[model samples]
Target: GMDYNQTVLSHLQKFWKHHDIKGFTWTLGRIVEELPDFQVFQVIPNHEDEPWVYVSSGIGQFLGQEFFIISPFETPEHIETLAMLASASMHYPDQFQLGKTVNIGRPWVEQSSFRHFLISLPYPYGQELEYMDNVRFFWLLPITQTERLFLNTHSVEELETKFDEAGIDYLDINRASTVWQA
Candidate 1:
Protein backbone atom coordinates (compact mmCIF):
# COMPACT_ATOMS: atom_id res chain seq x y z
CA GLY A 1 0.00 0.00 0.00
CA MET A 2 3.01 2.28 0.32
CA ASP A 3 5.22 3.67 -2.39
CA TYR A 4 8.78 2.77 -1.51
CA ASN A 5 10.77 5.02 -3.81
CA GLN A 6 8.96 8.25 -3.05
CA THR A 7 8.71 7.67 0.65
CA VAL A 8 12.30 6.67 1.15
CA LEU A 9 13.64 9.61 -0.81
CA SER A 10 11.45 12.04 1.04
CA HIS A 11 12.46 10.75 4.44
CA LEU A 12 16.10 10.71 3.49
CA GLN A 13 15.99 14.24 2.18
CA LYS A 14 14.24 15.47 5.27
CA PHE A 15 16.84 13.91 7.49
CA TRP A 16 19.72 15.26 5.46
CA LYS A 17 18.31 18.77 5.32
CA HIS A 18 17.30 18.91 8.98
CA HIS A 19 20.65 17.63 10.16
CA ASP A 20 22.61 19.56 7.55
CA ILE A 21 24.37 16.39 6.54
CA LYS A 22 26.16 16.67 3.24
CA GLY A 23 26.43 13.98 0.57
CA PHE A 24 23.78 11.88 2.25
CA THR A 25 21.46 9.96 0.01
CA TRP A 26 19.94 6.52 -0.07
CA THR A 27 20.28 4.57 -3.28
CA LEU A 28 17.73 2.10 -4.56
CA GLY A 29 20.33 -0.61 -4.56
CA ARG A 30 21.01 0.01 -0.90
CA ILE A 31 17.35 -0.08 -0.09
CA VAL A 32 17.01 -3.36 -1.88
CA GLU A 33 19.89 -4.81 0.02
CA GLU A 34 19.56 -3.25 3.46
CA LEU A 35 16.28 -1.93 4.71
CA PRO A 36 14.55 -2.39 8.04
CA ASP A 37 11.33 -4.38 7.91
CA PHE A 38 8.12 -3.16 9.49
CA GLN A 39 4.41 -3.86 9.53
CA VAL A 40 1.74 -1.17 9.49
CA PHE A 41 -1.87 -1.86 10.36
CA GLN A 42 -4.97 -0.43 11.90
CA VAL A 43 -5.74 -1.40 15.46
CA ILE A 44 -9.14 -2.85 16.12
CA PRO A 45 -12.05 -1.87 18.38
CA ASN A 46 -11.39 1.67 19.54
CA HIS A 47 -9.37 2.68 16.51
CA GLU A 48 -10.83 0.74 13.64
CA ASP A 49 -9.44 2.75 10.76
CA GLU A 50 -6.50 4.19 12.58
CA PRO A 51 -3.23 3.13 11.02
CA TRP A 52 -0.28 2.13 13.18
CA VAL A 53 3.29 1.72 11.97
CA TYR A 54 5.33 -0.88 13.81
CA VAL A 55 9.05 -1.54 13.45
CA SER A 56 11.18 -3.79 15.63
CA SER A 57 14.94 -3.52 15.50
CA GLY A 58 16.90 -6.45 16.87
CA ILE A 59 17.64 -6.27 20.57
CA GLY A 60 20.78 -4.26 19.98
CA GLN A 61 22.15 -0.93 21.05
CA PHE A 62 22.19 2.26 18.98
CA LEU A 63 25.34 4.01 17.81
CA GLY A 64 24.57 7.31 19.58
CA GLN A 65 21.72 9.26 21.08
CA GLU A 66 18.76 9.21 18.65
CA PHE A 67 15.51 11.06 18.30
CA PHE A 68 12.67 10.03 15.97
CA ILE A 69 10.23 12.09 13.93
CA ILE A 70 7.00 10.36 13.05
CA SER A 71 4.21 11.58 10.85
CA PRO A 72 1.57 13.54 12.73
CA PHE A 73 -1.04 11.53 10.82
CA GLU A 74 -0.72 8.84 13.49
CA THR A 75 -3.75 7.98 15.51
CA PRO A 76 -3.79 7.86 19.28
CA GLU A 77 -3.35 4.11 18.98
CA HIS A 78 -0.30 4.63 16.83
CA ILE A 79 1.20 6.98 19.37
CA GLU A 80 0.44 4.47 22.12
CA THR A 81 2.19 1.71 20.22
CA LEU A 82 5.29 3.88 19.79
CA ALA A 83 5.22 4.57 23.52
CA MET A 84 4.88 0.87 24.23
CA LEU A 85 7.91 0.05 22.13
CA ALA A 86 9.99 2.72 23.82
CA SER A 87 8.92 1.48 27.24
CA ALA A 88 9.62 -2.14 26.37
CA SER A 89 13.09 -1.27 25.14
CA MET A 90 13.90 0.42 28.45
CA HIS A 91 12.20 -2.36 30.44
CA TYR A 92 10.26 0.33 32.22
CA PRO A 93 6.88 2.03 32.05
CA ASP A 94 5.97 5.65 31.39
CA GLN A 95 9.49 6.85 30.84
CA PHE A 96 9.26 9.27 27.88
CA GLN A 97 6.68 11.86 26.94
CA LEU A 98 5.16 12.74 23.56
CA GLY A 99 7.19 15.75 22.52
CA LYS A 100 6.00 17.82 19.58
CA THR A 101 3.81 18.10 16.53
CA VAL A 102 5.85 18.71 13.42
CA ASN A 103 5.24 18.04 9.76
CA ILE A 104 6.97 14.99 8.28
CA GLY A 105 6.89 13.52 4.81
CA ARG A 106 5.43 10.02 4.44
CA PRO A 107 7.24 8.21 1.70
CA TRP A 108 7.24 4.44 1.95
CA VAL A 109 10.40 2.43 2.25
CA GLU A 110 10.28 -1.04 0.83
CA GLN A 111 9.42 -3.39 3.67
CA SER A 112 10.72 -0.69 5.95
CA SER A 113 7.99 -0.41 8.49
CA PHE A 114 10.64 0.37 11.03
CA ARG A 115 13.30 3.05 10.81
CA HIS A 116 15.98 3.65 13.46
CA PHE A 117 18.88 6.04 13.71
CA LEU A 118 21.33 7.68 16.15
CA ILE A 119 21.19 11.36 17.16
CA SER A 120 23.59 13.85 18.70
CA LEU A 121 22.30 15.96 21.56
CA PRO A 122 23.43 19.37 22.77
CA TYR A 123 25.11 18.37 26.01
CA PRO A 124 26.00 15.27 28.04
CA TYR A 125 26.42 13.51 24.74
CA GLY A 126 28.19 10.54 26.27
CA GLN A 127 26.92 10.72 29.82
CA GLU A 128 23.90 8.46 30.00
CA LEU A 129 20.48 9.80 30.78
CA GLU A 130 18.27 7.38 32.70
CA TYR A 131 15.24 7.20 30.41
CA MET A 132 16.57 7.33 26.85
CA ASP A 133 20.11 6.46 27.72
CA ASN A 134 20.23 4.04 24.81
CA VAL A 135 19.74 6.86 22.30
CA ARG A 136 16.31 5.84 21.03
CA PHE A 137 13.48 8.30 21.32
CA PHE A 138 10.15 7.87 19.60
CA TRP A 139 8.76 11.05 18.04
CA LEU A 140 5.32 11.92 16.74
CA LEU A 141 4.67 15.01 14.66
CA PRO A 142 1.29 16.46 13.86
CA ILE A 143 0.61 15.36 10.32
CA THR A 144 -2.38 16.41 8.28
CA GLN A 145 -4.59 13.51 9.31
CA THR A 146 -3.63 13.46 12.97
CA GLU A 147 -3.91 17.22 13.18
CA ARG A 148 -7.47 17.01 11.94
CA LEU A 149 -8.33 14.63 14.73
CA PHE A 150 -6.58 16.77 17.29
CA LEU A 151 -8.43 19.84 16.13
CA ASN A 152 -11.81 18.13 16.17
CA THR A 153 -11.30 16.63 19.58
CA HIS A 154 -10.10 19.85 21.14
CA SER A 155 -10.61 23.40 20.03
CA VAL A 156 -7.57 25.68 19.82
CA GLU A 157 -8.61 27.33 23.06
CA GLU A 158 -8.99 23.99 24.83
CA LEU A 159 -5.66 22.81 23.48
CA GLU A 160 -3.91 25.91 24.74
CA THR A 161 -5.57 25.65 28.13
CA LYS A 162 -4.71 21.99 28.59
CA PHE A 163 -1.15 22.54 27.47
CA ASP A 164 -0.86 25.37 29.98
CA GLU A 165 -2.28 23.20 32.75
CA ALA A 166 0.27 20.51 31.95
CA GLY A 167 3.01 23.17 32.14
CA ILE A 168 4.32 22.06 28.77
CA ASP A 169 5.74 24.78 26.50
CA TYR A 170 6.40 24.83 22.77
CA LEU A 171 10.09 24.94 23.48
CA ASP A 172 9.87 21.79 25.55
CA ILE A 173 8.70 19.91 22.48
CA ASN A 174 12.15 20.37 20.94
CA ARG A 175 13.84 18.97 23.99
CA ALA A 176 14.48 15.25 24.17
CA SER A 177 10.94 14.52 25.36
CA THR A 178 10.78 10.88 24.30
CA VAL A 179 13.90 9.44 25.82
CA TRP A 180 14.60 5.70 25.91
CA GLN A 181 17.82 4.89 27.71
CA ALA A 182 18.23 1.20 27.29
Candidate 2:
Protein backbone atom coordinates (compact mmCIF):
# COMPACT_ATOMS: atom_id res chain seq x y z
CA GLY A 1 0.00 0.00 0.00
CA MET A 2 3.03 2.28 -0.12
CA ASP A 3 3.12 4.85 -2.90
CA TYR A 4 6.59 3.85 -3.98
CA ASN A 5 6.32 0.08 -3.60
CA GLN A 6 5.18 -0.38 -7.20
CA THR A 7 8.02 1.79 -8.37
CA VAL A 8 10.52 -0.27 -6.42
CA LEU A 9 9.05 -3.52 -7.68
CA SER A 10 9.16 -2.38 -11.29
CA HIS A 11 12.78 -1.37 -10.98
CA LEU A 12 13.76 -4.66 -9.34
CA GLN A 13 11.87 -6.67 -11.91
CA LYS A 14 13.77 -4.92 -14.67
CA PHE A 15 16.88 -6.77 -13.58
CA TRP A 16 15.48 -9.89 -11.95
CA LYS A 17 12.42 -10.72 -14.00
CA HIS A 18 13.42 -14.34 -14.29
CA HIS A 19 14.04 -14.69 -10.56
CA ASP A 20 11.29 -15.53 -8.12
CA ILE A 21 10.36 -12.42 -6.20
CA LYS A 22 8.10 -12.36 -3.19
CA GLY A 23 6.80 -9.34 -1.28
CA PHE A 24 6.01 -9.54 2.43
CA THR A 25 4.33 -7.25 4.91
CA TRP A 26 4.78 -7.87 8.62
CA THR A 27 1.48 -8.38 10.37
CA LEU A 28 2.47 -10.33 13.44
CA GLY A 29 4.56 -8.26 15.77
CA ARG A 30 5.54 -4.91 17.31
CA ILE A 31 6.86 -3.91 13.91
CA VAL A 32 3.29 -3.70 12.75
CA GLU A 33 2.66 -0.99 15.31
CA GLU A 34 5.93 0.83 14.75
CA LEU A 35 5.83 0.96 10.96
CA PRO A 36 2.90 -0.89 9.61
CA ASP A 37 3.62 -0.13 5.99
CA PHE A 38 7.20 -1.30 6.08
CA GLN A 39 7.75 -4.27 3.77
CA VAL A 40 10.57 -6.45 2.49
CA PHE A 41 11.02 -8.02 -0.93
CA GLN A 42 12.84 -11.31 -1.30
CA VAL A 43 14.33 -12.17 -4.67
CA ILE A 44 15.24 -15.83 -4.93
CA PRO A 45 17.84 -16.44 -7.56
CA ASN A 46 17.25 -19.09 -10.21
CA HIS A 47 20.88 -19.68 -11.04
CA GLU A 48 23.75 -20.96 -8.92
CA ASP A 49 25.71 -17.76 -9.46
CA GLU A 50 22.96 -15.49 -8.26
CA PRO A 51 22.64 -14.52 -4.60
CA TRP A 52 19.44 -14.20 -2.66
CA VAL A 53 18.28 -10.58 -2.50
CA TYR A 54 16.35 -8.83 0.24
CA VAL A 55 15.20 -5.24 -0.11
CA SER A 56 13.16 -3.03 2.15
CA SER A 57 10.39 -0.61 1.27
CA GLY A 58 8.83 2.36 3.15
CA ILE A 59 11.87 3.34 5.25
CA GLY A 60 12.82 5.70 2.46
CA GLN A 61 9.50 7.41 2.82
CA PHE A 62 10.94 9.07 5.88
CA LEU A 63 14.70 8.98 5.30
CA GLY A 64 15.16 9.02 1.52
CA GLN A 65 17.35 5.90 1.75
CA GLU A 66 16.36 2.25 1.58
CA PHE A 67 18.26 -0.90 2.51
CA PHE A 68 19.04 -4.14 0.71
CA ILE A 69 21.26 -7.17 1.23
CA ILE A 70 22.67 -9.83 -1.08
CA SER A 71 23.33 -13.14 0.57
CA PRO A 72 24.42 -16.65 -0.41
CA PHE A 73 21.83 -18.46 1.65
CA GLU A 74 18.07 -18.58 1.87
CA THR A 75 16.69 -18.16 5.33
CA PRO A 76 13.83 -16.42 7.12
CA GLU A 77 16.47 -14.81 9.31
CA HIS A 78 17.46 -12.48 6.48
CA ILE A 79 13.96 -11.14 6.17
CA GLU A 80 13.70 -10.71 9.94
CA THR A 81 16.95 -8.81 10.03
CA LEU A 82 15.84 -6.46 7.27
CA ALA A 83 12.57 -5.87 9.03
CA MET A 84 14.37 -5.10 12.29
CA LEU A 85 16.77 -2.73 10.57
CA ALA A 86 13.93 -0.93 8.82
CA SER A 87 12.29 -0.20 12.14
CA ALA A 88 15.56 1.08 13.56
CA SER A 89 16.23 3.21 10.48
CA MET A 90 12.80 4.78 10.67
CA HIS A 91 13.27 5.50 14.35
CA TYR A 92 16.79 6.86 13.94
CA PRO A 93 17.31 7.92 10.38
CA ASP A 94 20.33 10.11 11.07
CA GLN A 95 22.35 7.24 12.53
CA PHE A 96 22.36 5.21 9.33
CA GLN A 97 24.80 6.33 6.65
CA LEU A 98 27.26 5.22 4.04
CA GLY A 99 30.67 4.01 5.26
CA LYS A 100 29.30 3.44 8.74
CA THR A 101 28.81 0.12 10.49
CA VAL A 102 25.75 -1.21 12.31
CA ASN A 103 25.98 -3.88 14.94
CA ILE A 104 23.21 -6.41 14.85
CA GLY A 105 24.26 -7.28 18.45
CA ARG A 106 24.57 -10.96 17.54
CA PRO A 107 25.81 -13.31 14.91
CA TRP A 108 24.13 -12.64 11.56
CA VAL A 109 22.82 -16.18 11.81
CA GLU A 110 23.45 -19.17 14.06
CA GLN A 111 27.01 -20.52 13.82
CA SER A 112 28.05 -17.42 11.90
CA SER A 113 30.84 -14.94 12.56
CA PHE A 114 29.34 -11.83 10.99
CA ARG A 115 28.07 -9.48 13.67
CA HIS A 116 28.12 -6.13 11.94
CA PHE A 117 27.05 -4.59 8.66
CA LEU A 118 28.90 -2.11 6.50
CA ILE A 119 26.75 0.43 4.75
CA SER A 120 27.99 0.75 1.22
CA LEU A 121 26.91 1.54 -2.29
CA PRO A 122 25.23 -1.15 -4.35
CA TYR A 123 28.48 -1.84 -6.18
CA PRO A 124 27.55 -5.16 -7.70
CA TYR A 125 24.32 -3.84 -9.15
CA GLY A 126 25.63 -0.35 -9.88
CA GLN A 127 23.64 2.87 -10.35
CA GLU A 128 20.81 1.12 -12.09
CA LEU A 129 19.66 -0.64 -8.91
CA GLU A 130 20.79 2.17 -6.65
CA TYR A 131 18.15 4.74 -7.46
CA MET A 132 14.43 5.28 -7.80
CA ASP A 133 12.79 8.67 -7.54
CA ASN A 134 14.53 10.69 -4.83
CA VAL A 135 15.43 7.60 -2.78
CA ARG A 136 18.83 5.88 -2.99
CA PHE A 137 19.32 2.21 -2.21
CA PHE A 138 22.20 1.18 0.04
CA TRP A 139 23.75 -2.28 0.23
CA LEU A 140 24.44 -3.88 3.60
CA LEU A 141 27.61 -5.96 3.52
CA PRO A 142 28.04 -8.27 6.49
CA ILE A 143 31.46 -8.02 8.11
CA THR A 144 33.34 -9.48 11.03
CA GLN A 145 34.60 -7.46 14.01
CA THR A 146 38.12 -7.53 12.62
CA GLU A 147 36.93 -5.91 9.44
CA ARG A 148 34.92 -3.39 11.40
CA LEU A 149 38.03 -2.46 13.37
CA PHE A 150 39.97 -2.21 10.12
CA LEU A 151 37.66 0.63 9.14
CA ASN A 152 38.75 2.55 12.25
CA THR A 153 42.27 2.96 10.90
CA HIS A 154 41.66 2.72 7.14
CA SER A 155 39.33 4.28 4.64
CA VAL A 156 36.15 2.53 3.50
CA GLU A 157 37.69 2.42 0.04
CA GLU A 158 40.69 0.55 1.40
CA LEU A 159 38.58 -2.12 3.04
CA GLU A 160 36.59 -2.50 -0.14
CA THR A 161 39.82 -2.77 -2.06
CA LYS A 162 40.99 -5.60 0.17
CA PHE A 163 37.76 -7.39 -0.49
CA ASP A 164 38.05 -6.95 -4.22
CA GLU A 165 41.71 -7.91 -4.41
CA ALA A 166 41.11 -11.04 -2.37
CA GLY A 167 38.15 -11.95 -4.57
CA ILE A 168 35.93 -12.20 -1.52
CA ASP A 169 33.17 -14.71 -1.88
CA TYR A 170 30.04 -12.98 -0.71
CA LEU A 171 28.23 -16.24 -1.24
CA ASP A 172 30.13 -17.76 1.66
CA ILE A 173 28.19 -16.94 4.82
CA ASN A 174 31.21 -17.71 6.93
CA ARG A 175 33.76 -16.04 4.72
CA ALA A 176 37.02 -15.01 6.37
CA SER A 177 37.69 -11.41 7.25
CA THR A 178 39.67 -9.54 4.63
CA VAL A 179 41.47 -7.25 7.04
CA TRP A 180 45.03 -8.33 7.59
CA GLN A 181 46.13 -8.95 11.15
CA ALA A 182 49.54 -9.32 12.75
Off by over 4 Å in 1: 1-32, 36-135, 143-182
Q: Which one wins on lDDT?
A: 2
Q: In model 2, which runs have C-alpha deviations exceeding 4 angstroms?
A: none
Candidate 1 lDDT over 51-156, as tens digits, reads 2232222212322222333322334434334333433434522222233332222312222222222111222222331123333424332222332345445554
Candidate 2 TM-score over all chains jointly? 0.92
| Model 2: per-residue Cα lDDT over 1-182, one tens digit each | 57688777777888776877899887787578877777888998887877889998878777888888887777778788888887788777776888888888787776788888889999889998888888898998888889988888899999989989988876677888888666
lDDT of 2: 0.83
TM-score for candidate 1, residues paired by index: 0.23
Q: Candidate 1, 10: how far from true, in Å? A: 30
Predictions in order: lDDT: 0.30, 0.83
**Candidate 1 C-alpha RMSD relative to the actual structure:** 17.3
Find the number of clashing residue pairs for candidate 2.
0
Model 2, position 181: C-alpha lDDT score:
67
